[PDB]
Design an enzyme around this catalytic site. Structure first.
Site, mmCIF file in Angstrom:
data_model
loop_
_atom_site.group_PDB
_atom_site.id
_atom_site.type_symbol
_atom_site.label_atom_id
_atom_site.label_comp_id
_atom_site.label_asym_id
_atom_site.label_seq_id
_atom_site.Cartn_x
_atom_site.Cartn_y
_atom_site.Cartn_z
ATOM 1 N N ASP A 29 0.739 -1.193 0.119
ATOM 2 C CA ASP A 29 0.006 0.016 0.034
ATOM 3 C C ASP A 29 0.733 1.156 -0.023
ATOM 4 O O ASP A 29 1.474 1.575 1.104
ATOM 5 C CB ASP A 29 -0.860 0.017 1.165
ATOM 6 C CG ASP A 29 -1.855 1.210 1.157
ATOM 7 O OD1 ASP A 29 -2.037 2.077 -0.077
ATOM 8 O OD2 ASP A 29 -2.490 1.346 2.248
ATOM 9 N N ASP A 218 -1.345 5.404 -5.754
ATOM 10 C CA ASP A 218 -1.515 4.722 -4.419
ATOM 11 C C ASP A 218 -1.967 3.235 -4.887
ATOM 12 O O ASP A 218 -3.124 2.844 -5.557
ATOM 13 C CB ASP A 218 -2.931 5.135 -3.623
ATOM 14 C CG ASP A 218 -3.383 4.290 -2.695
ATOM 15 O OD1 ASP A 218 -2.654 3.579 -2.181
ATOM 16 O OD2 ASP A 218 -4.507 4.270 -2.123
#
Length: 367
Positions: A29, A218
């Site tokens: 992440d 992201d």
């Protein structure tokens, strides 16, 4: 330049934690900055990290609650060793949050049981002073402050991930040239978007609307998320440039799927995102083909791979699946390059080209 295998919505790597090592599956992440793992049994995971089993684990006597766009958890904070063998180094001492309470974080169907936040310290909870996983790696192994991701799940329906390169870049994972765009702010991986094009025609929105609040890279977000006004503009332009006469509202919202041997990909336009170059007088563009935002879910049914946001323009996995992405923190830039691993059936899913002059756009598109 440690090259870790990835498997795959979300891309995760196998991580050895503790003494004796326990093997867990950790989501990569780049939109958060906490290392957290399941610390108790959960219905939707098959394993978790048990602190009792590790000789090296040391509690730091406090909890932390991290919240995301969707989902949240609470976990005890401590430190343990993550085993990544290289040279005379067996493991690295990192901060770790062991989750004992969570809501809508562990979901039915997920294959991971932890999350690896690779963003900047600014996003770390409880404070920025809680050393990030990658900063721990950089300081202890003295590797370059750079990592890169190759995601190869383009075309894989939702029902081998690629590679995570820690400490640099692997030329074998991309072809052509790398184009670098500056990092405007070190919290998320915030970059400056200047223009969006659909089917060759530019959206005539102020370039500050692409950056209203932030435009970020992201890997922890699945779809391409756009601020509402940008989303409405994109949907309208896609519908017009498409060879499909009409669209149900549910298709755009994701409430409905289109079911079809033949692909709908040749009926949809390309979408290009223009990014400012390190040379402020120029821009380059990353282009996604329908193969990336018209996504197979299972005769196949497809979903619109773009969703509306309120706050941010999130370059999620469905865009990163078309490129080799380089998170060059040492030089405050994000690099993009063509990825052979992203092709479907020998056909490209993305393009990248440049340079383009930025004489016609404002010097700073971030409000």
């Amino acid at each position: 330049a440690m090259v870790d295998n990835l498997q795959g919505r979300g891309y995760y790597l196998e991580m050895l934690i503790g003494t004796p090592p326990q093997k867990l599956q950790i989501l990569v992440d780049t939109g958060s900055s906490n290392f957290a793992v399941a610390g108790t049994p959960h219905s939707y995971i098959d394993t978790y990290f048990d602190t009792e089993r590790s000789s090296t684990y040391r509690s730091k006597g406090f909890d932390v609650t991290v919240k995301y766009t969707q989902g949240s958890w609470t976990g005890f904070v401590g430190e343990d060793l993550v085993t990544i063998p290289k040279g005379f180094n067996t493991s690295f001492l990192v901060n770790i949050a062991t989750i004992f309470e969570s809501e809508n974080f562990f979901l039915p169907g997920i294959k991971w049981n932890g999350i690896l936040g690779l963003a900047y310290a600014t996003l770390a909870k409880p404070s920025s002073s809680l050393e990030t996983f990658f900063d721990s790696l950089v300081t202890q192994a003295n590797i370059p402050n750079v990592f890169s991701m190759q995601m190869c799940g383009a075309g894989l329906p939702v029902a081998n991930g690629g590679s995570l390169v820690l400490g640099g870049i692997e030329p074998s994972l991309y072809k052509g040239d790398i184009w670098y765009t500056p990092i405007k702010e070190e919290w998320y991986y915030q970059i400056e978007i200047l223009k969006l094009e659909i089917g060759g025609q530019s959206l005539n929105l102020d370039c500050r609307e692409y950056n209203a609040d932030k435009a970020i890279v992201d890997s922890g977000t699945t779809l391409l998320r756009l601020p509402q006004k940008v989303f409405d503009a994109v949907v309208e332009a896609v519908a017009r440039a498409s060879l499909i006469p009409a669209f149900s509202d549910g298709f755009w919202t994701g409430s409905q799927l289109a079911c079809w041997s033949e692909t709908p990909w040749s009926y949809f336009p390309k979408i290009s995102i223009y990014l400012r170059d390190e040379n402020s007088s120029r821009s380059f563009r990353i282009t996604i083909l329908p193969q990336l935002y018209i996504q197979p879910m299972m005769y196949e049914c497809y979903r619109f791979g773009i969703s509306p946001s309120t706050n941010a323009l999130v370059i999620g996995a469905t865009v990163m699946e078309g490129f080799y992405v380089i998170f060059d923190r040492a030089q405050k830039r994000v690099g993009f390059a063509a990825s052979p691993c992203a092709e479907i059936a020998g056909a490209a899913v993305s393009e990248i080209s440049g340079p383009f002059s930025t004489e016609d756009v404002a010097s700073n598109c971030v409000p």
